[PDB]
Swiss-Prot record, chains A, B:
Name of the molecule in the record: 3C-like proteinase nsp5
Activity regulation: Inhibited by pyridone-containing alpha-ketoamides compounds 13a and 13b. In turn, alpha-ketoamide 13b (tert-butyl (1-((S)-1-(((S)-4-(benzylamino)-3,4-dioxo-1-((S)-2-oxopyrrolidin-3-yl)butan-2-yl)amino)-3-cyclopropyl-1-oxopropan-2-yl)-2-oxo-1,2-dihydropyridin-3-yl)carbamate) inhibits SARS-CoV-2 replication in human lung cells. Inhibited ex vivo by michael acceptor inhibitor N3. Inhibited ex vivo by compound 11a and 11b.
Consequence the record notes for mutating residue 145 to A: Complete loss of 3C-like proteinase nsp5 cleavage
Outcome reported for the amino acid change (mutating residue 189 to A): Does not affect ability to cleave and inactivate human TRMT1
Residues of the full protein shown: 3264 to 3567 of 7096
Species for this entry: Severe acute respiratory syndrome coronavirus 2
Effect of residue 205 to V: In strain: Zeta/P.2
Active-site residues annotated for this sequence: 41, 145
Topology Cytoplasmic: residue spans: 1-304
Effect of residue 142 to A: Does not affect ability to cleave and inactivate human TRMT1
Subunit organization: 3CL-PRO exists as monomer and homodimer. Only the homodimer shows catalytic activity. Interacts with host FBXO22; this interaction promotes the proteasomal degradation of nsp5.
Domain Peptidase C30: 1-304
Result when mutating residue 90 to R: In strain: Beta/B.1.351
Location of this chain's protein in the cell: Host cytoplasm; Host Golgi apparatus; Host nucleus
């Protein structure tokens, strides 16, 4: 029993973190097989970051300008290329700790673990969600760029995020491992405002199911609703619209608890309209939206 | 910027987890050097757990009855002994992945990371605190016993917790790695009620400092207080008394922010008396108490 904001075990990813230095800029790289992946802004001075021309800045860089250190041993760079907003540094040594891995581009509302790193060294692991506005709410100081986000399926690491940027509002933006930003953001020190940070409704419902499974039931009421009725309330409260696809995804949690998805929607509707009245659910005073239905099943069933 | 409930990177501990089976009971063990540490209740049937005599149950057990599996390779048990509530299984192979480590018995209010495991396989990592009533609020299903709690100082893992028990109230109890329970709990399926789960005041203040550092400042007020005045309010709200030792520990955060500890106490006093009025601090609608002053400094300074 008990329900925690749980990250994947980080060991498989710790074995992939390296330091990348280009001139006076140091950040993190990801070493998989004989390629090191890092943010292309490693080539920028802080001055460069106001309006960088990355292709032009890269012409001035040779393999020997990219210093890659794995622990306290230097890797030899034998090639480099830019793919979107990431550099791929080809090294002469395959990472012997390379796990089974994939690169995945996640959808908003999907959760992942972040291994926060500085100078190629892991500092901490925490659980994030891709927000509906394609930001994440992370914990990143200067030096953390190139820290990655991932999911694990048994022994396969799916890398979904590389840290690039903090917006002036202190939320975070980054890329998939093909170097494509999530959302509209660019690797430039310019005005970039995030859109509405809407609540991930299907995740809230998942977490209400987790609450019921773990004995927190006070919020269950005598009501039901319809998708259309619920969605009028969702809109009013800056919740994402609930689709039949979301209802389908919650089917296993509905089955386990015997609470129809639309009944849990009516419970959520009353919580939105009434608030918590000073009560808590799974030790939270607000409705938690960074657990997916898959996260709730995994944690409630003990998948390794 | 940003402030997250962050666990230590789990790799060093993942390399120590093994499966221990005794008859039909399987749980987790910790393999350090040539010793495997596990809960002594591995020797119990569920029937045994109502009123176990561990010394008597252990007489019926030989080295060959303790099946220890590290991945998919069996370890040879060449000795076994009971130390308090843990068994120490001597194996013929030193764990080649043994990190630098220590065994520490933590005090209430101290935080640590838990690597939740099943059948010797890591499932997840999360951050806990030792509650003032010597329970922890974990996420543990059947099979998770022998999962451990730890802190890391650079390359030294300090193990502070091994999971043994879920109370009928769904909170968790366990031992240090010498097998001594935290608090009054015993490894027996009997009535065990936890005492008052008081709020860890020094940790709340640390987290208010973290909030100010990360730009959440709405709760800062024009007031100060005294330790005695604050403590009258703490008592009323089931907060731990604040001591000068706690004020001393918060000194670095006071210095960094320029907010006197007693001024932050007066801000906390008003939050206790007024509530949040529907506002949030670092994305929380309640006052968070599972960050220590050391955690706030570490996370805010990027220690690896
Ligand atoms: N992609 C990207 C990218 C965009 C803007 C910048 C500007 N620098 C910045 O925000 N840092 C934050 C931490 O402290 C030092 C300066 C850097 C990288
Ligand atoms: N130390 C200890 C200890 C105390 C009581 C028990 C009784 N079993 C129990 O609570 N589990 C919970 C999970 O589902 C199956 C039964 C076991 C170990």
């Amino acid at each position: 029993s008990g329900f925690r904001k749980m990250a994947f075990p980080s060991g498989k990813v710790e074995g992939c973190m390296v330091q990348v230095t280009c001139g006076t800029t140091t950040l993190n790289g990801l070493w998989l097989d004989d390629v090191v992946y890092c943010p292309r802004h490693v080539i920028c001075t802080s001055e460069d970051m106001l309006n960088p021309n990355y292709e032009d800045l890269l012409i001035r860089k040779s393999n020997h300008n990219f210093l890659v250190q794995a622990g306290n041993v230097q890797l030899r760079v034998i090639g480099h290329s830019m793919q979107n907003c990431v550099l791929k540094l080809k090294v002469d040594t395959a990472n012997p700790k390379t796990p089974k891995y994939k690169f995945v581009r996640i959808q908003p509302g999907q959760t992942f673990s972040v291994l926060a790193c500085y100078n190629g060294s892991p500092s901490g692991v925490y659980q994030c969600a891709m927000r509906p506005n394609f930001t994440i709410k992370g914990s990143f100081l200067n030096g953390s760029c190139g820290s990655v986000g991932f999911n694990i399926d048994y022994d396969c690491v799916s890398f979904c995020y590389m840290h690039h940027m903090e917006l002036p509002t202190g939320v975070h933006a980054g890329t998939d491992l093909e170097g494509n930003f999530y959302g509209p953001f660019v690797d430039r020190q310019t005005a970039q405002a995030a859109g509405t940070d809407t609540t991930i409704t299907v995740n809230v419902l998942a977490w209400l199911y987790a609450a019921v499974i773990n004995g927190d039931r006070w919020f269950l009421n005598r009501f039901t609703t319809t998708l259309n009725d619920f969605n009028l309330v969702a809109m009013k409260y800056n919740y994402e619209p609930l689709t039949q696809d979301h209802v389908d995804i919650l089917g296993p949690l509905s089955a386990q608890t015997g609470i129809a998805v639309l009944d849990m929607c009516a419970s959520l509707k009353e919580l939105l309209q009434n608030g918590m009245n000073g009560r808590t659910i799974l030790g939270s005073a607000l409705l938690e939206d960074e657990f997916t239905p898959f996260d709730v099943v995994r944690q409630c069933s003990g998948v390794t």
